[PDB]
Amino acid sequence: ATCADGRTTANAACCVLFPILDDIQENLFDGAQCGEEVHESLRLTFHDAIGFSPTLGGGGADGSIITFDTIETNFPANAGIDEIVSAQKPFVAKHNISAGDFIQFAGAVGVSNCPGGVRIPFFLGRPDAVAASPDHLVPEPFDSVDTILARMGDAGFSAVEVVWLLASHSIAAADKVDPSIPGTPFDSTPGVFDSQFFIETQLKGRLFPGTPDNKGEVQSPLQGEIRLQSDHLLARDPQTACEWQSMVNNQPKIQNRFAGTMSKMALLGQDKSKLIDCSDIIPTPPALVGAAHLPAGFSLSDVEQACAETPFPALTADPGPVTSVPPVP
Ligand code: HEM
Ligand SMILES: [Ca+2]
Ligand SMILES: [Ca+2]
C-alpha cells in the first residue's frame, strides 16, 4: 500500500501511523532521542498490559491506564506513571487510534531510537478500554520472587520471558524508589540498549546511592546506580539466574528475545488474528555503542555467581579507577 505522502506499508490501515510516528518523534521524543520520555513510555507499555489475568480480569493492553487514569494512576504500584500518562493524553486525543494502540506504538517507536535497540512487532486495532484494571496486578520491586514469577505467569509469561522483558531495565531509571535521587539508572548506560544491566546486577552490592531503608531497594555496586530488590533476587534465583547470565555479552539474544516477548506483552487481552500487522512502520534502530564490560576497577571476583550450570563469562573491566554514573536528565 501507498500512503498519503508516498511512504509505503504492507497493510493500508497502517497508513494512519505515519503522521503519528512523525508527531511523537518530533514532539514527544525530542527528535527521536533515547531519554526520559522513551524510558517512561516503555514503562507505560508494561503498566497498561500487565493488568490482565484469566481469572482476576483486566483487559490487558487496552489503554485502560490512560482512559481510566484517575483510577489506575492512584494504585501504589503505578507510582510516577502519572507524568507520562499526562504527556501522552493530548496525543491520543489528537490522533485517530485507540489509547491501547497508541501506548504500544509509542513504546515500540521509542525503543527503536535507542542505540542497540530492536524493532518490536506492532499490531493495530485494539478497541477502547472497557473498564479500569483491577488493582494488585502489577508486580512491585518488594514482592517475593515467586510472587513476581507467578503474577507474570498468570498473565502468560514463563520465567525466562520475565528475564527477557527485564532487558527494558537496560534503558531505565527510578524516580520514586529513592526520591532523594530521581533519575538514577539501573545500569551505567541508560541511553544504550545493551547487556550492562545483566552484568551490573550480578555484582556484589557495595553501597546505597542515596538513602538507606527504601522499600524495594537493595545495595548497588556503583555510585549513581540503583538496584531494585526484585532485580537483585531475579539475578540470583535458580529459576532465572542462568537465563539472566546468558544475556551477558549476547546482544543478538537480548534484541530478539526482547522483541518477541514485547510483542506478546503488547497483545495481552487481545487476539493477534483480530489485529492488523503494522510492524514495518517501526524505524531502524541505531547500532550498539560500546562493548560488554565490568565497571572500572572491578574484576571477576566481584561477580556473585548464581547460575549452577555455567560460570559467569570473563569480561574485561573498563580502565582506570571506578567512577560514578550520571543521572538521566
Ligand atoms: C518484572 C517485574 C518488574 C518490576 C518489579 C519493576 C519495577 C520497576 C520499578 C520499581 C521502576 C522504577 C519506578 C520509579 O520509581 O520511578 C521501574 C522502571 C522501569 N520499568 Fe520496570 N519492573 C518490572 C518489569 C518491567 C517490564 C516487564 C518492563 C517492560 C517494558 C519494564 C520497564 C521499565 C522501564 C523502561 C523503567 C524506567 C522508567 C523511567 O526511566 O522512568 N519494567 N520498574
Ligand atoms: Ca490495561
Ligand atoms: Ca544500558
| Distances, alpha carbon 159 to alpha carbons 47, 162, 194, 270, in Å | 18, 5, 20, 21
DSSP code, position 270: S
Residue 46, ligand 1, Cβ within 6 A: yes
Ligand 1, atom nearest to 175 Cα: 16
The residues with which 220 forms a beta bridge, in sequence order, are 207
Yes or no: is domain 11-138+262-289 CATH 3.30.365.10? no
Query: For residues 74 and 76, what is the distance between their CA atoms, to the nearest angstrom?
Result: 6
Q: Strand 276-277 and strand 173-174: pairing?
A: unpaired
Residue 13: CA count within 13 A, CB half-sphere: 12
Residue 198: CA count within 13 A, CB half-sphere: 29
Residue 175, ligand 1, Cβ within 6 A: yes
Query: For residues 166 and 99, what is the distance between their CA atoms, to the nearest angstrom?
Result: 24
Query: For residues 277 and 68, what is the distance between their CA atoms, to the nearest angstrom?
Result: 27
Ligand 1 center to residue 216 CA distance, Å? 12
Contact 295/317 with Cβ under 8 angstroms? yes
| Candidates 39, 164, 169, 244; catalytic one | 164
The technique by which this structure was obtained is X-ray
Residue 83, ligand 1, Cβ within 6 A: no
Handedness of CA 92, 94, 98, 101 (dihedral sign): negative
Torsion angle in degrees (nearest 10) through CA of 47, 258, 283, 40: 30
Q: For residue 308, give the amino acid letter.
A: A
Contact 72/58 with Cβ under 8 angstroms? no
Ligand 2 center to residue 179 CA distance, Å? 26
Q: Which of 291, 255, 283 is nearest to 33 (CA)?
A: 283
Query: For residues 329 and 322, what is the distance between their CA atoms, to the nearest angstrom?
Result: 22
Q: Which of 130, 156, 155, 157 is nearest to 59 (CA)?
A: 130
Contact 221/204 with Cβ under 8 angstroms? yes
Q: Which of 83, 42, 76, 110 is nearest to 266 (CA)?
A: 42
Query: For residues 153 and 53, what is the distance between their CA atoms, to the nearest angstrom?
Result: 10
Torsion angle in degrees (nearest 10) through CA of 124, 127, 133, 139: -10
Select from 46, 47, 243 the residue to mutate for testing ligand 1; criterion: most ligand atoms less than 8 Å from CB. 46
Query: For residues 70 and 322, what is the distance between their CA atoms, to the nearest angstrom?
Result: 44
Ligand 2 center to residue 137 CA distance, Å? 10
| Distances, alpha carbon 303 to alpha carbons 46, 169, 246, 294, 312, in Å | 30, 19, 14, 9, 8
Q: In CATH, what number does 139-261+290-329 get?
A: 1.10.420.10
Q: For residue 102, give the amino acid letter.
A: F
CA angle 135, 138, 140 (to 5 degrees): 115
Q: Which of 225, 116, 112 is nearest to 178 (CA)?
A: 225
Grid cell locating 226: 540503583
The residue ranges of every structural domain in the chain are 11-138+262-289, 139-261+290-329
CA angle 181, 226, 187 (to 5 degrees): 120
Sorted by sequence, the CB contacts under 8 Å of residue 77 that are 6+ apart come out as 47, 135, 136, 138, 139, 140
For the chain, state the CA radius of gyration.
Answer: 19
Sorted by sequence, the CB contacts under 8 Å of residue 22 that are 6+ apart come out as none
Q: Is 47 a catalytic residue?
A: yes
CA 267 to centroid of chain Cα atoms: 15
In the chain, which residues are last before a break of more than 2.5 Å from C to the next N?
A: none
Contact 85/78 with Cβ under 8 angstroms? no
The residues with which 166 forms a beta bridge, in sequence order, are none
Contact 126/67 with Cβ under 8 angstroms? no
Sorted by sequence, the CB contacts under 8 Å of residue 118 that are 6+ apart come out as 111, 112, 193, 255, 256, 258, 259, 285
Q: Which of 326, 297, 308, 306 is nearest to 316 (CA)?
A: 297
Grid cell locating 202: 550480578
Q: Which of 148, 317, 79, 77 is nearest to 221 (CA)?
A: 317
Query: For residues 88 and 21, what is the distance between their CA atoms, to the nearest angstrom?
Result: 13
Grid cell locating 32: 527521536
Contact 138/50 with Cβ under 8 angstroms? yes
Nearest bound ligand to CA 139? Answer: 1
Q: Is 244 a catalytic residue?
A: no
Please tell me what resolution, in angstroms, this structure has.
1.1
Helices (H), the chain: 17-27, 36-49, 64-67, 69-72, 82-94, 99-112, 145-155, 159-165, 196-200, 229-234, 241-246, 251-266
Grid cell locating 16: 494512519
Contact 178/172 with Cβ under 8 angstroms? no
